[PDB]
Design an enzyme around this catalytic site. Structure first.
Site: not given
Ligand code: HEB
Ligand code: HEB
Ligand SMILES: NNC(=O)c1ccncc1
Ligand SMILES: NNC(=O)c1ccncc1
Ligand code: NA
Ligand code: NA
Ligand code: NA
Ligand code: NA
Lengths: 707, 707
Positions: A84, A252
């Site tokens: 982020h 993931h």
């Molecule tokens: C390279 C790296 C990466 C990327 C590109 C992504 C891409 C994404 N993603 Fe992520 N995620 C992640 C790595 C990631 N991812 C992790 C490591 C986590 C969790 C950690 C903890 O255990 O807190 C998440 C977590 C997460 C959650 C839960 C939050 C809490 O703590 O409860 C959600 C609703 C999301 C959505 C999402 C979307 C709609 C997209 C479009 C494509 N994700």
């Protein structure tokens, strides 16, 4: 009391359209707390990177009582932080990214999507304390997810250091027109126009989301719309299909969604919360928000049977099972498997002898349901080795796509390899006789306009938002650049022919020459004025090859507007001065610098098209305050000639003395800019003008020099 | 494009209450265009004042074709300029005044009341051009009305120079809550509360008016309400009854109201007008706005038969004739005489052989109709000599009430006389043995708290808004100051007893000693930490006498809130941190300085009342980053104990470790301030903290030193 002590008591209430010059004056002495001989680049070198990773690894499994790590492992959270942190980057303007530590200040510190990242940042504090001035937050944050991946079993491609910290929000960034958080894609101020097209400078589908919505388009599950949404947003953060899948699966492949509670019952975002919350946010004082009874997205469950380990769970669950909409306990569209095995059930975050559920976001489903993504998902399913190699690169690109060239990269884990998106450039011929090259440049039947424009134009691409562009690498001579209209390809061709051979003849880089060509041209216009000086010079610039030059990428840098050369490719809907302000800011110029650069480049007749708008002189090609002098002179009156054009007319005689554009006249109308234009029009300030223009010129030309 | 290039695209849309730290970071390197070795005070000295007045006189009767001087005499306009330039000043906070040239930037450049002053400023341009960097606009503007009065026949009391220029609007000033211009005194956001009381920090009756409304209270003629309105507003700009009448008569003794047209037909205020207007405003392109068919107030006519001459016309017309409401041609309540003589008719601005009318504003009528003012008006009627002496002083006070002490005054016409409102101070004993006085101070059984508080408190009065207050003059020992609660008069008494005799013993001023007392105390707490240094020292401060001390005036400087010493006299309706921000700004401190000063003064136990809120130490009386260290420490959680109080509690044990106020905890909650608090809590920054605290300390103590 009588101060203006809350933020909304501004001059921006009466004249909302008025130019935001405050964005040029950012990150100055008074906001900056460091000494003035402080320099991080050299200070970071001294850091014990070895020990640092000892401690990040340490932390990832040191669950703190005030915010309990899922399973005794913060790994998940820490990645998300870094994701982020980097998520904000967009290629249009290069703004956003992990590059500044922008996430610990508003607005980003309080985006819905950045929910609970406030905790992550704080969890890191004690390390940043321990290492002090040798470890900026921007870097620390960018490392956290990278060490997390290691500790969870992924060989990451590497890491740089050297992201300097800021001390307030980047005022220059426009995040989108919306007034409330996460609205529908139709409200009075929606960012969507036409064919549901996301207006061309932004990378999220709505305000305060990172890339896309997880409940589907507008809260409405549809794996195949979502798919589309993902494809554009990621493309605008420079990721391709392969990369995008790789990243999403890769993320993931560890961690969990948290939505085991009542969302509304969470406290106010950190900028909204009161002094008692220690500048954290989304705190829940009513009931428990830690560990197991914890809410974040609103979604609940983990994508994989083992969420603290790197494994193939993500595609195994996604491709083997069939999935169906259901609702988190907080009430959110998620997908779950239709009758899975108990073995596949991720256990509970507190008590490992309780099996919980699996999820997929609508964006995870987009990976299976979209025909193109499906083909890639299959490839990573039956070739994990490839998946992990692809992903580790993409994560490293993700976390460094904004640091610009490798000159600025630092510390022991830097890929020795050159990536194409590091816009690489050879080292240049450090030493050789400069004065000789000046000599030969002067020889050529080459005007000050020609010299200076070309030099200007090679340099004008630079932008600090992500440190791409610049004089260096002379990519101007190469495609796609030497065919851009604003860049005047005839004039260009002509000049390069000359300068290429002068550079061949000399073993000084075309770049160094292209620059030095400008330098000369200035000095010639200056001497002709009567002040004779030697402009400083930074030799050493390389000449990047077209192989090491991703031409599709370089389109986002095309100049389609440049006030400094009275260039406008179309009639845009943003004012041509608003446009300049943007450009100027990205160069890193101040308001006064912006002011002189106009004044000088006008009278040197650098105007694109051989146009003579704002060339208030008889002494065209001669560095004088002539522009400022006639601009401020009330023997004239200004008349619109329609469409970014005005006629400057003698009041008594009614004849038209010159023409000009809004870019030119903004300096005689805006109260702050006319303050500067009046200054330089003073009788006593011709030397000032000229010293000043030159400093600014120089600044622009050494913009991309990280050596 | 993707920049935030218009003013309303701010972070102040989502969190309007959030602290406006931007006001601390004003007037910095990047906004300032001058070099860094530039210094105006020394540059102005070099100016040919003689020649300057040659040219101002010149101009007053050089009518320009683009804005025709009434009768070939700009005198009237030029006075109004200077009046309105100075009009903004208010005694509560000292903000506003002629002192900065604030009028050429928004918002003031576009106030309704400042209508057509845009032209005045421009008329002056060519002079400011001619003299360049030796004549700021702030000064030029303050002179213009003063030379005008000379050229029109008044011996003015004198003039100083040395008002430095700014390059953008003073963000620190709050002009009132209103959202539209000149509204009724009841709208949703009216500045009037209770008994029609104008809320206690503002000096105009409504937004974008200078002092009062000329059509009467709320547009409703009533000479005796108006009278009241005038009496309070002027009192809040430090003028008394005698002065007020003198000024109003004195102003209107020359010049005219302009309202011979249709107001609505005028163009937009200068900040609203487009680039073609050359940054002027209220231009009328439809019909003629110059000379005779010209509108300004909406009122029309001149107060006197000879408006280009200084004479007794004002009271002669006002007292001899009887007057009656009528309506300007633009449609405005004015008073005219009931059947006057043709001899008494001011002639026309273009054709002198056409007689026009006389006027009085409701505020002029207030002078006759109010019983108290009437008595003064009579006095000036039958004693012009007195009138002119009184008025010339008041005009000179008006135009200099904000320059502070005479140390800063410059140039040949400065009244050698001391005025009481110049808060005068003797020169101090320049040289003597400092180290000796340090020695004797240390001797006394006098704690670091005692030392440092007193030193702090003598200094804390200073405010740049109008350069009153400071360490200098030691007015702390005198009334009214030594009886102010926040100032702890017992502690105070005790310390002074000692320091007075040590100063008697030494022939160093009580001021110098009071300061040096602080200095020592710091050095003692610092050494005890282990870093031993010598704090710098500026001897030379005088000790002002109570005769030369207008005690009623000094009440506006009483500290009724000081976060730096966790002092709050009442529970105000503004937050105690908003309150600090105001104070801090007036001292001229930055955000980081503000941050260290808290950190240090806490641990030195300077807390007013011997309270221990925010004293996070075992090592009370010892200069350490201890505050920053425990503030940032998440072994603690913060609990409201109601009303500007919190309890710092151990999370595991639940015991209460310390207490604190919002002032203390704001540095651990605000994202920008916690950035600074984290910095100073780093392991590697104890020397930084201490160097830094000390620089800031020093800055505050030499705040009022203009020598
Ligand atoms: C390279 C790296 C990466 C990327 C590109 C992504 C891409 C994404 N993603 Fe992520 N995620 C992640 C790595 C990631 N991812 C992790 C490591 C986590 C969790 C950690 C903890 O255990 O807190 C998440 C977590 C997460 C959650 C839960 C939050 C809490 O703590 O409860 C959600 C609703 C999301 C959505 C999402 C979307 C709609 C997209 C479009 C494509 N994700
Ligand atoms: C000191 C000085 C002064 C003062 C204080 C004053 C005060 C006053 N004021 Fe004044 N005003 C004046 C000076 C003055 N003033 C002048 C000078 C003028 C005019 C000029 C011309 O001509 O413009 C006037 C003017 C005026 C006018 C008209 C404008 C035009 O232009 O049109 C009016 C409305 C007024 C009001 C007033 C009021 C309400 C007040 C209250 C008090 N006024
Ligand atoms: N809401 N998310 C968490 O509480 C968390 C996530 C990943 N690791 C540890 C904690
Ligand atoms: N609107 N006011 C004027 O045009 C004016 C006033 C005083 N002297 C000259 C011109
Ligand atoms: Na960026
Ligand atoms: Na996993
Ligand atoms: Na002021
Ligand atoms: Na007169």
């Amino acid at each position: 009391h009588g101060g203006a002590t809350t933020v909304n008591i501004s001059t921006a209430e009466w004249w909302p359209k008025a130019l935001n010059l405050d964005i040029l004056s950012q990150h100055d002495r008074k906001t900056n707390p460091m000494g003035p001989d402080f320099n991080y680049q050299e200070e970071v070198k001294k850091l014990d990177v070895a020990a640092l990773k000892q401690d990040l690894q340490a932390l990832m499994t040191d669950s703190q009582d005030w915010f309990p790590a899922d399973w005794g492992h913060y790994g998940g959270l820490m990645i998300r932080l870094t994701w982020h942190a980097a998520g904000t980057y967009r290629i249009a303007d290069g703004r956003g990214g992990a590059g500044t530590g922008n996430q610990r200040f508003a607005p980003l510190n309080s985006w819905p999507d950045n929910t609970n990242l406030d905790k992550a940042r704080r969890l890191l504090w004690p390390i940043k304390q321990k290492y002090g001035n040798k470890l900026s937050w921007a870097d620390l944050i960018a490392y956290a997810g990278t060490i997390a991946y290691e500790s969870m079993g992924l060989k990451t491609f590497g890491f740089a250091f050297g992201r300097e910290d800021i001390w307030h929000p980047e005022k220059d960034i426009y995040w989108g027109p919306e007034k409330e958080w996460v609205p529908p894609s139709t409200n009075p101020n929606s960012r969507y126009t036409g064919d549901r097209e996301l207006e061309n400078p932004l990378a999220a589908v709505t305000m305060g989301l990172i890339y896309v919505n997880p409940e589907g388009v507008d809260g409405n599950p549809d794996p195949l719309k979502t798919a589309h949404d993902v494809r554009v947003t990621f493309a605008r953060m420079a990721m391709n299909d392969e990369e995008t899948v790789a990243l999403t699966a890769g993320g993931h492949t560890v961690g969990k969604c948290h939505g085991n509670g009542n969302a509304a019952l969470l406290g106010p975002e950190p900028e909204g919360a009161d002094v008692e919350d220690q500048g954290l946010g989304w705190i829940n004082k009513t009931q428990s928000g830690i560990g197991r009874n914890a809410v974040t997205s609103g979604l609940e469950g983990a994508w994989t049977p083992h969420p603290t380990q790197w494994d193939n769970g993500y595609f195994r669950m996604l491709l083997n099972y069939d999935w169906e909409l259901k609702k988190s306990p907080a009430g959110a569209w998620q997908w779950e498997p239709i009758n899975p095995r108990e073995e596949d059930l991720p256990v509970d975050v507190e008590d490992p002898s309780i099996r919980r559920n699996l999820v997929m976001t609508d964006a995870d489903m987009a990976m299976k349901m979209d025909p193109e993504y499906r083909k890639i998902s299959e490839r990573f399913y039956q070739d994990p080795a490839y998946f992990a190699d692809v992903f580790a690169r993409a994560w490293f690109k993700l976390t460094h796509r904004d640091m610009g060239p490798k000159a600025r990269y630092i510390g022991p884990d830097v890929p020795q390899e050159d990536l194409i998106w590091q816009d690489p450039i050879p080292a240049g011929n450090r030493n050789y006789d400069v004065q000789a090259v000046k000599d030969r440049i002067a020889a050529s039947g080459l005007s000050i306009s020609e010299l200076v424009s070309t030099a200007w134009d090679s340099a004008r691409t630079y932008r600090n938002s992500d440190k791409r562009g610049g004089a260096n690498g002379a990519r101007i001579r190469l495609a796609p650049q030497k065919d851009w209209e604003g860049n005047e390809p005839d004039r260009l061709a002509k000049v390069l022919a000359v300068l290429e051979g002068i550079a061949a003849a000399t073993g000084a880089s075309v770049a160094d020459v292209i620059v030095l060509a400008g330098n000369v041209g200035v000095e010639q216009a200056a001497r002709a004025a009567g002040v004779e000086i030697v402009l400083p010079f930074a030799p050493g610039r390389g000449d990047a090859t077209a192989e090491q030059t991703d031409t599709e990428s370089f389109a986002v840098l095309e100049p389609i507007h440049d006030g400094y050369r009275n260039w406008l490719k179309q009639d845009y809907a943003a004012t041509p001065e608003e446009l300049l302000l943007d450009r100027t800011q990205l160069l890193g110029l101040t308001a006064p610098e912006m002011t002189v650069l106009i004044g000088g480049l006008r009278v040197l007749g650098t105007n694109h098209g051989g146009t003579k708008h704002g060339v208030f002189t008889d002494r065209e090609g001669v560095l004088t305050n002539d522009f400022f002098v006639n601009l401020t002179d009330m023997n004239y009156l200004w008349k619109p000639a329609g469409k970014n054009l005005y006629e400057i007319c003698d009041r008594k005689t009614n004849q038209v003395k010159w023409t000009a554009t809004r870019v030119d006249l903004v300096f005689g109308s805006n109260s702050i800019l006319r303050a500067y234009s009046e200054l330089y029009a003073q009788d006593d300030n011709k030397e000032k003008f000229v010293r000043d223009f030159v400093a600014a010129w120089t600044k622009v030309m050494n913009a991309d020099r990280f050596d």
